[model samples]
Target: RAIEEESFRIVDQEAGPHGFSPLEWPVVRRMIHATADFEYKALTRFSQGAVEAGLKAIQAGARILVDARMIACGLNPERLRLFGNEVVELLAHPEVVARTRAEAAVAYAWEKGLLDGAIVGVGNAPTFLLALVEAIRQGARPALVLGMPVGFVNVLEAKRALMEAPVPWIVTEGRKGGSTLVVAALHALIRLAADGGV
Candidate 1:
């Protein structure tokens, strides 16, 4: 715990001046701290009200839907339980069948009406983010979309689509994100919620 606090302090000192708000800086700092990559400072982007929306959703015991089970694995379940949040990852669901399992999981969640007001996290698959954007266009409104899928293929495009979506979002603008970053952002939000920052 002390190591984490000290790491964040160093990250803050080295991160220099930036434009992220108080609520946003914690999330961004966590990402940079997790990956030890300063480039995250430039890659990360948050939509208007995105942090506030996340805080509200988490405080209300919102369901969390993640594209990859690994994202769920990285989460702190005890902290999530503080708000009674449910983390759902449907990649291995029996009914999910599509060209890609990630996209199929999104479709299944959308079909089950699980997207509305949920906090959606896409960490590993660009296709999942793309499908989520399409779902949002079709009127499935999640409280916040953490659209930070990694890899080069269609990653930028998917993030761009999320930027244009009507729902609130936090995203990495390029090909520099993964399940770890997604977990970091959610953990920051959970802490913020638990500490009355919401």
Candidate 2:
């Protein structure tokens, strides 16, 4: 706890004077804590009411749909269970396992009506993000989308598509995000939910 306090204090000092709202600051700060990369300070982007939507979803026990197993492995279900939330790793879903494509799994999940009011986190696959963008365009109303996928090819294009999406989202603007970053971002929102949304 002491270490965390000191780390946050250092982050606050170095990250002085920002445009992030009170509700958004902690989430951004936590990202910095996770990666020790102040670039996330500038790279992170949030849609209007994104954090609020995420908090509401978490509080309401929304299912968290993740594109990769790393995110699922990192997320502690017991922690989320405080609010009765469940983490569904798309890569592990039977349909995805059968099809063997993250992109296909997202489409299937959406078709199965798993995305309505759910929280979707894309950490490892740009193709999955592309598929998710298509789903959002087709009227999939997810509670929140954590659209951080790290890579060289198609990463920028997929993230740009997310920026154009109408649904609520939190994304890193560049190729710097990965599963750990997505995990950190969600954990930040989950902490905010636990704190009753400050």
Candidate 3:
């Protein structure tokens, strides 16, 4: 194996020191490996059905809605298409301004009917996470939400709110989440689906 593969082997070996279900260990291992943060072993919480829901949704060609351009661009569009899924980025629309961007994205998403059985990825702004949760409260439904918005201010509270959402979610506790962490966690799930490990 190459260095990258070797590192993942090391991660798998050292991951989940506290033990995890087979369903959860792979995601945790990939999170820790992606961020090089061992604390994810404990801080990451998966909704009872998040992984399975995400895997099945992806397999069923569910669309993925992302909050930021970086996250949208970073993912492998080709691989996603192979599963008959597409990535939708709503942040660049005219109505999404600096002040109302996140909320506007939610509105646009609602107008487009993108939330049903969709995979929601909020990786950059806490406002986006908050809006997502609020949207859910207002009766929108997504298959799985990856809510990892980084920073102080509303970040922790937003994730906490997401934790309480009735929908499936993968969340990182506390104030240590960000775009990179979000991408890491999401890629972990994607990899798992690709491997049929779920």
Candidate 4:
């Protein structure tokens, strides 16, 4: 089919033999295909166990926490359900809008006690990532942080702060990220668990 063929063509063309190893290829390849952006080849970076931790957490029925409901919506709920995993986002909650994105995210994570061993995703706001930095500082032990906020307002700085964490992460460097990109990255992980792509 054109879709799969083109996807593999683009991935193989850009990925090259020197790029991510077999274990990491599925993530990088699907991420690029999801966005049709070759730039991710350079921007996307990972910690040692990002994919491993994310898969394990989901396999353990750990819920996914996203900064925006949109990110959660972007994912395939049916696939998530197959893993017994749920996608959670803060946007719709009444308390979220009244406060800054970061503050609301921190409050939710702290109150729900979901920061430990969960996958955290941030895509629309730097404030969300900023708040997660605080959450992590305050003893949040997330299994994986998929931090990829887009736009200009303190985005790069916030992403840098997240990269500083010692925990597992799948992040894009520079200013090339958003809610969709983060969701796409997460989808790759989800697919890895369901289809053995990783």
Count of backbone collisions in candidate 4: 0
Residue 123's lDDT within candidate 1 is 85
TM match of model 4 to true structure: 0.90
Task: Write model 1 residue lDDT over 115-196, tens digit each, in one string.
Answer: 9999999888888888889988898999999999999799989998999999999998888889999999999999998877
Model 3: which ten-residue window has the lowest total lDDT?
A: 93-102
What TM-score does model 1 achieve against the real structure?
0.95
Please, what is the whole-model Cα lDDT of each candidate in the order they appear? 0.90, 0.88, 0.80, 0.79
Off by over 4 Å in 3: 94-99
Winner by lDDT: 1
Give the Cα RMSD of candidate 1.
Answer: 1.6
TM-score of each: 0.95, 0.95, 0.91, 0.90
**Clashes by residue pair, model 1:** none
Query: What is the descending TM-score order?
Result: 1, 2, 3, 4
Judging by TM-score against the true structure, name the best candidate: 1
Query: Which pairs clash inside model 2?
Result: none
